Amino acid sequence: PTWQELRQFIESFIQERLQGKLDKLQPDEDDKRQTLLATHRREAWLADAARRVGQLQLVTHTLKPIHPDARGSNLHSLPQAPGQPGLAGSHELGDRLVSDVVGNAAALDVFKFLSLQYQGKNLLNWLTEDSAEALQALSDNAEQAREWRQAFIGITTVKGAPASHSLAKQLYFPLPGSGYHLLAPLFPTSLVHHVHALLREARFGDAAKAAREARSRQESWPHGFSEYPNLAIQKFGGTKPQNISQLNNERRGENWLLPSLPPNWQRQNVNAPMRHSSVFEHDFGRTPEVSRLTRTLQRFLAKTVHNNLAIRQRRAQLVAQICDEALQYAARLRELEPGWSATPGCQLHDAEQLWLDPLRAQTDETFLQRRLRGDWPAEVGNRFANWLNRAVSSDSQILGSPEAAQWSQELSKELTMFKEILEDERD
Amino acid sequence: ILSTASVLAFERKLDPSDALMSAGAWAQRDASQEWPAVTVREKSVRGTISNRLKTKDRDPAKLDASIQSPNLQTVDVANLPSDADTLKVRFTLRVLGGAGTPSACNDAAYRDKLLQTVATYVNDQGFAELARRYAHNLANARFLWRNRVGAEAVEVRINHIRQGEVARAWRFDALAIGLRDFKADAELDALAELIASGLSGSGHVLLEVVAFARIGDGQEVFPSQELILDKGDKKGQKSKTLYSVRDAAAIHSQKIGNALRTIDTWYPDEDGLGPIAVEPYGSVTSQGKAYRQPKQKLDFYTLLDNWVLRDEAPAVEQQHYVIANLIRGGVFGEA
Amino acid sequence: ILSTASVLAFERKLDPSDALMSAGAWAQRDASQEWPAVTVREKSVRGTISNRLKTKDRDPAKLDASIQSPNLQTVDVANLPSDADTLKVRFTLRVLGGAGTPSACNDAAYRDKLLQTVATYVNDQGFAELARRYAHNLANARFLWRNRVGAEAVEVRINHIRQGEVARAWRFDALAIGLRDFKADAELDALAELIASGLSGSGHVLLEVVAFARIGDGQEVFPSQELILDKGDKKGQKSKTLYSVRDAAAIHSQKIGNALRTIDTWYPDEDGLGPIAVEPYGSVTSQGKAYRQPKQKLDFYTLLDNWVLRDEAPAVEQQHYVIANLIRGGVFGEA
Amino acid sequence: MNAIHIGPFSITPAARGLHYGGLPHHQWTLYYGPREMAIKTLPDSYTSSEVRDEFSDIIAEFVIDARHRYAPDVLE
Amino acid sequence: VTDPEALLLLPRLSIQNANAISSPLTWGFPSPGAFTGFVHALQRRVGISLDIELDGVGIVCHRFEAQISQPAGKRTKVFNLTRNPLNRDGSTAAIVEEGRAHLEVSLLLGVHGDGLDDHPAQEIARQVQEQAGAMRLAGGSILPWCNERFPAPNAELLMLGGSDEQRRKNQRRLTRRLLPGFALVSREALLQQHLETLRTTLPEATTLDALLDLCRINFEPPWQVRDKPGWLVPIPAGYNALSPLYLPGEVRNARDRETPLRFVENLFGLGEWLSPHRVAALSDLLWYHHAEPDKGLYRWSTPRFV
């Protein structure tokens, strides 16, 4: 509200800056202290600040993460919020926005001087508007105030012609009718800073680690936490992160990428169930995915029926996931040797070996091809249903009530779909 | 005025796959489709300090104290089995066409002038020398690198795959064909003609290259080592990590490509090294020194700019070097 | 001024393999190709308090309380069968040649000077004494580290493998050929000449070394040992882990190479200890001390720098030591 | 460094160190009185908090097993 | 945006070193924009000559493998890199980290046009196969399956079957072909539904927090885990405008001077990996371009899924 108090604050801040640089330098000779006190205490320091602002720029999407030899145009832009649903971006970033700094790594003092909150809010909005409190505390003359204001406000604008370097990415996007646009994207440093803050709070925050310690002792807590597995680290500066940006200096590289991975990204091996009697309980049963599925089915078997429609729906796609994983497991056994089912053994699951190895019919033109064609084994579905009955909780309350009736009906639907899948395997 | 393009790029022609490593016995190289793969294992090594001291660690007491601390490391190691003496290295190679066509380029007049320059080169002598040198680098086992060093006998079998079958098959003795001399052989000329036809074509020509090196019974083979940055973590890591695709030791595709690119014998320095990999500013990673410096008028950028803009056509060898760089690819262009 | 190179990497000559150890019967060692491999087993030990106390807990009450609760742990253990008295250890050695040539060298003038120095060494004294000492270390079973100390009789059979067949076969009584003296023997001189031809680059040498030692029926054998970082309770207190390749006990290749390198009898201290492994700063891990201190002018780096840069050729023994270091290989060179 | 005491537990370091990779290391062993529970080889650049966090999980599972083993019997 | 007259099953394509850096916030499988651009390049190179249109791609990911490693003592992961050539002064250049991964995918291409009746289905399927055999899918080469046991032939099936039973059988057999894999679909509606649920849970919640919550492993005290309906990966959903649309000649250092250039920024959406048996028709998995250049929103998605 008063220019006198703003002058008092800025003089105070340059006073701690002066004493800090004198203490750090410890100048006992060469007349360094006199030059420091004659250049960083008056309006001459504001002249140097106006000089240094022209080399720096506040941005929200920088280009320097893309190959650091690329010289392009960095932008400080917030995209408009789309009407289309279910997608994220920079347009969610409102008041929780942090502005990047690009340029020299030694002139960033003017950035923290310009991002001050003296009377309650930032200097940027004060210098954009014609505020009586501002525009006079920094200059006694009007022309000096005007030139310093234009200098300190142009730091958020695009400097130079719009250019994206050769090392930067430019990606054609086909227009709906016979056209293309070039779409040079910039690295959203504001988004990765916001997600870095969120992930740092989730993985190293005080409440988060308190919840982790509560789970470690298996006790209750008013809130839970998150785990964030399979995070990837992409560093931008090999040894000098400050050459990219100040936000990339706060987090030294460390893009903290999220795991967009398919379910088969950790394929272990394929093995033949040789000397075992039933694959679904002996070799199929201890793959980690189906183990998790049957444990979720175990937990959901004994549950309240207040939301019984949603619970039955969830269990329906649950048992659908078990049958899908069974089909996938047979499909990946299809890449084994064609005649592994003919190996000697007392227990080799001959009833299910017709479905486990389709490829045996090629070598055995008359031994087992016609048997598999004519029989069309669908009792494998019955055996897997018996395995699922062995894998469901033995609750008599569900069996007496109609809950077991609904569970048996949805199981019958999933098993008849599964049997129809195994029906046309001879095509 | 024919200003050079601000954005210039070339697609990687002549791109190989990962060299799968497998093991077996010699004189059974024909039935090697079921040879078991070479697996990357783990072993512990305990060494002693053997690096140079910085004139302050040369005190005997400090040296003895540092030796009394055991130096333990975990390394990835790849070995032939104790009953197999032959290492089989197999990879696939695609010789793409449209060799002189840039993938991205701004100026359309620069497009026409560059395509005219490549047309003049191809109808003058074509890819006869370049495909000859590439076929030589295929014929000798230069893509084995350290696996080629102490092998009793190396044989390279190269098959042309047209649809799904061997259209034409080659067999070479890699140790007879030198690593620095590019002679002429009838089968080598046929392979060079096939590679040049692939480079001049509109599609691609597929080759599989299978090399058998008689390393020794149970000896230690050398897959490509993986580049992992320590990034200043406090825990000690494994010092050596080997590359594998599916539980099978392999050599990186760019390693094989660098082996195939070792055709440049026209750099201004003497050929004490022999051929070097075709790169802009003639860099050699093993020698730590970049030949074809821009202070001399023999680097790729100045040669190309003189050839296409000022029409100063260089020597035939330098034209071969420029077109070999076009085969290699790269992201070019000034701001 | 010819300063030494910053990158002076050297590759390893005399490449050994992992030594797989099997078991059988003496006087049945001629037909020992079908002998079953020695398997690494697990056994339980209960250790008592037998270490030095720290002068704080030497009071009887705490010592008795510690004795009342001994520690239980599982160790990997390898033994011969109770009906097998001898151990067969088999590995293949490959002599490469080209010792003076570095694998990586960023200084060309230094590389030329070093090559000239090694060439004039070879012209003056070829790989004759070094190969003789390597032949001694092959003839006696020094690669049997603890399997040799109490053996009744040790026999080493070395076969030169040319084109997959035994071109020449050797047979040595490894207990007659001691671990202390480098004497003269006609068969051993032939082996030394073959190793010399391998080191000089005049031929491809691949040796298959088989050692038979009578330890006893069911007696413990000593393969290589792996490092354990975490013990825990999920693992059954695994305290010692032995090295194996495929369910077969084995010795690390670097241990075999260290046993071959034990040729250095020229260190400034007395040779009452005997030969030591060829290392920079002459270090011995068991002795905890470094012979050839850098303070004295007999370590590898100062001798090499004086020999190459200032042309100060050392004594012939020190030249042998330097060339043995070059054969051994390393990451020689400063930052 | 120095032994870390966590209630009845003690994390004492080895007197002599070692080098794993290129970094110095010491073996830190966890005790419950006279019972040795686990040994871990840890970098010398770890502080006491990181060494304690390395054994926090083993301490927590000891606590869980002790709660389940000596839980009082329930009347219904 | 259109119903294909046929489905073109590109067989198992072994992709060598695909860009594992899908977005500035996600890693792993390549972006669907890469696959849609590859299909558009197929149409631009061979689709026009065959008088057909290649729009829509079905991604199944029969096999995935990223060149990654986990450092000791850390639970996160790092990317294995390549040694680039030295500078002109003989020193090591600054390392720019890129992720490179091995794929094995089979693509369902939506085909509609007059060339389907003009040419045999096997002929156009073949010619598309050897056109794609000399191309790139996500920055990596394509391995063309030489001298293995047997190559997988290309198969084009017309969706206009002779009967409903014949169409259903053809769809099931095509699903059986690409069985060891998981179809990739988009879940924008699910993401919006979860965001509304989160907003009723607590206000002023952005869709970024809903996207993060749908992918992270949540632990709740009595210690259970909040279950997820499917795999629910976060994927880049397209590009949003960051600058006014410049003329083709305004922007310095452009890719060309014939195409307008607009600076953009990534849009992050929800995706799902699911078995191909859980889709009604195999044409519901096809990914399409949705540009709408007036407001930016250069998006790729798979509509008509549910």
Domain limits for position A386:
264-427
Q: What angle do CA C312, C314, C320 make, to 5 degrees?
A: 135
What is the C-alpha separation between A165 and A69, in angstroms, rounded? 9
Pairing of strands E63-66, E183-186: unpaired
Does the beta carbon of E245 lie under 8 angstroms from any beta carbon of chain A? Answer: yes
Phi, psi of B301 (to 5 degrees): -70, -50
Q: Which amino acid is at A49?
A: A
* Same domain assignment for residues C231 and C118: no
What is the C-alpha separation between E64 and E81, in angstroms, rounded? 18
The DSSP letter of residue B281 is: G
Distances (CA, A) of B198 to B160, B262, C95: 11, 19, 42
What is the C-alpha separation between A256 and E24, in angstroms, rounded? 9
Task: Return the number of CB contacts < 8 Å for B and D.
Answer: 32
D20/B238 touch (CB, cutoff 8 Å), yes or no: no
Number of domains in chain A: 2
* Same domain assignment for residues C41 and C189: yes
Q: Which amino acid is at C211?
A: A
Q: Which of C232, C262, C292 is the last residue of a domain?
A: C262
- At how many degrees (to 10) do helices C300-308 and C316-328 cross? 110
Q: What secondary structure does DSSP assign to C12-69, as a single string? A: PSSB---EEEEEE-TT--TT-TTPPBPPEEEEEEEE---S---SSS-SHHHHHHHHHS
Q: Which of B60, B217, B287 sits opposite C295 (nearest CB)?
A: B60
* Same domain assignment for residues A240 and A256: yes
Neighbouring chains of A at 3+ CB pairs under 8 Å are B, D, E
* Same domain assignment for residues B119 and B233: no
Q: What angle do CA B288, B290, B294 make, to 5 degrees?
A: 155
* Strand ranges, E, within A75-212: 87-88, 100-102, 173-175, 179-181, 184-185
* Same domain assignment for residues B323 and B307: yes
* Same domain assignment for residues A341 and A421: yes
Q: Which of C222, C228, C226 is nearest to C249 (CA)?
A: C222
The DSSP letter of residue E45 is: I
B239/D23 touch (CB, cutoff 8 Å), yes or no: no
* Nearest Cα residue in chain B from C164: B26
How many CA atoms lie within 13 Å of B214's alpha carbon, on the beta-carbon side? 20
C/A Cβ contact: 3+ pairs below 8 Å: no
- CB-based contact E281:A217 (threshold 8 Å): no
Distances (CA, A) of A377 to A276, A374, A391, A420, D74: 20, 9, 23, 11, 52
Sign of torsion over alpha carbons A243, A249, A252, A255: negative
Domain limits for position B47:
12-98+127-262
- CB-based contact A352:A372 (threshold 8 Å): no
The DSSP letter of residue C212 is: E
Q: Which of A87, A163, A238 sits opposite E252 (nearest CB)?
A: A163
E159's tokens: 């969706």
Task: Return the number of CB contacts < 8 Å for B and C.
Answer: 115
What is the C-alpha separation between A274 and A175, in angstroms, rounded? 56
Query: Which of B26, B52, B53, B286 is best to mutate for the C interface (most C CBs within 10 A)?
Result: B52
Q: What secondary structure does DSSP assign to B97-146, as a single string? A: S-TT-EEEES-HHHHHHHHHHHHHHHHHTTTHHHHHHHHHHHHTTGGGGG
Q: Tell me which residues of chain B have a C-beta less than 8 Å from any C-beta of chain D.
A: 68-73, 234-239
B9/A71 touch (CB, cutoff 8 Å), yes or no: no
- CB-based contact E20:E30 (threshold 8 Å): yes
For chain A, the farthest-separated pair of C-alpha atoms sits apart, in whole angstroms, at 105
What is the C-alpha separation between A186 and A90, in angstroms, rounded? 12
* Same domain assignment for residues B211 and B67: yes
- Please give, rounded to a whole number of angstroms, the shortest distance from the CA of E124 to a CA of chain A: 23
* Nearest Cα residue in chain B from C161: B216
The DSSP letter of residue B15 is: E
* Nearest Cα residue in chain C from B236: C229
- At how many degrees (to 10) do helices C108-124 and C300-308 cross? 100
Q: Name the strand (E) or helix (H) holding E168.
A: helix E164-177
Reduced to 3 states (helix: H, G, I; strand: E, B; else coil), residue B215 is coil
Beta carbons within 10 angstroms of residue B175's beta carbon: 18
Q: Which of C18, C208, C301 sits opposite B79 (nearest CB)?
A: C18
* Strand ranges, E, within chain B: 8-10, 15-16, 19-24, 40-47, 71-79, 86-96, 102-105, 154-161, 166-173, 204-214, 220-221, 250-251, 262-264, 276-277, 283-284, 289-290, 330-332
Q: Using CB atoms within 10 A of its CB, is residue C33 exposed (0-12), middle (13-18) or buried (19+)?
A: exposed
Distances (CA, A) of A281 to A264, A326, B30, E291: 22, 12, 43, 50
Domain locations in chain E as residue ranges: 4-181, 182-302
Q: Which of D21, D25, D50 sits opposite B239 (nearest CB)?
A: D21
E235's tokens: 């994927």
What is the C-alpha separation between A208 and A227, in angstroms, rounded? 10
* Same domain assignment for residues C207 and C248: yes
Reduced to 3 states (helix: H, G, I; strand: E, B; else coil), residue A250 is helix
Reduced to 3 states (helix: H, G, I; strand: E, B; else coil), residue D2 is coil
- CB-based contact E191:E199 (threshold 8 Å): no
* Same domain assignment for residues C156 and C298: no
C8's tokens: 């002076």
Alpha helices in chain C (DSSP H): 60-68, 108-124, 129-139, 186-199, 253-260, 300-308, 316-328
What is the C-alpha separation between A236 and A251, in angstroms, rounded? 10
Q: What angle do CA A336, A342, A348 make, to 5 degrees?
A: 90
C103's tokens: 């694998």
Q: Which of A384, A378, A337 is nearest to A358 (CA)?
A: A337
Q: Which amino acid is at B335?
A: A
* Same domain assignment for residues A256 and A287: no
What is the C-alpha separation between B252 and B233, in angstroms, rounded? 26
B72/D19 touch (CB, cutoff 8 Å), yes or no: yes
What is the C-alpha separation between C304 and C310, in angstroms, rounded? 10
What is the C-alpha separation between A322 and A317, in angstroms, rounded? 9
Q: Name the strand (E) or helix (H) holding A59.
A: strand A57-59
What is the C-alpha separation between B248 and E18, in angstroms, rounded? 20
Task: Provide the chain E residues 106-145 that lie in CB contact (below 8 A) with chain A.
Answer: none
B332/A166 touch (CB, cutoff 8 Å), yes or no: yes
* Same domain assignment for residues A119 and A245: yes
Beta carbons within 10 angstroms of residue B122's beta carbon: 17
Reduced to 3 states (helix: H, G, I; strand: E, B; else coil), residue B89 is strand
* Same domain assignment for residues C158 and C258: yes
Q: What angle do CA C103, C105, C108 make, to 5 degrees?
A: 130
* Strand ranges, E, within chain E: 6-19, 26-28, 52-59, 63-66, 68-69, 77-79, 100-113, 142-143, 155-158, 183-186, 218-220, 224-225, 233-241, 263-274, 288-290, 298-301
Q: Name the strand (E) or helix (H) holding A145.
A: helix A142-153
Q: Name the strand (E) or helix (H) holding A387.
A: helix A379-390
Helices and strands counted in chain B (H then E)? 7, 17
- CB-based contact B208:B91 (threshold 8 Å): yes
What is the C-alpha separation between A325 and A331, in angstroms, rounded? 10
* Same domain assignment for residues B165 and B290: no
Number of domains in chain C: 2
Q: Using CB atoms within 10 A of its CB, is residue C122 exposed (0-12), middle (13-18) or buried (19+)?
A: middle
* Same domain assignment for residues B315 and B166: no
* Same domain assignment for residues B179 and B285: no
- Please give, rounded to a whole number of angstroms, the shortest distance from the CA of B125 to a CA of chain A: 32
Q: Which of B220, B238, B262 is the last residue of a domain?
A: B262
Query: Which of C3, C91, C253 is best to mutate for the B interface (most B CBs within 10 A)?
Result: C253
Sign of torsion over alpha carbons B111, B116, B121, B123: positive
Q: Which of E89, E102, E141 sits opposite B94 (nearest CB)?
A: E141
Does the beta carbon of E181 lie under 8 angstroms from any beta carbon of chain A? Answer: yes
Reduced to 3 states (helix: H, G, I; strand: E, B; else coil), residue E265 is strand
Bridge partner list, E292: none
What is the C-alpha separation between D64 and E118, in angstroms, rounded? 73
* Same domain assignment for residues B81 and B107: no
Q: Which of E27, E179, E278 sits opposite A232 (nearest CB)?
A: E27
- Please give, rounded to a whole number of angstroms, the shortest distance from the CA of B55 to a CA of chain C: 9
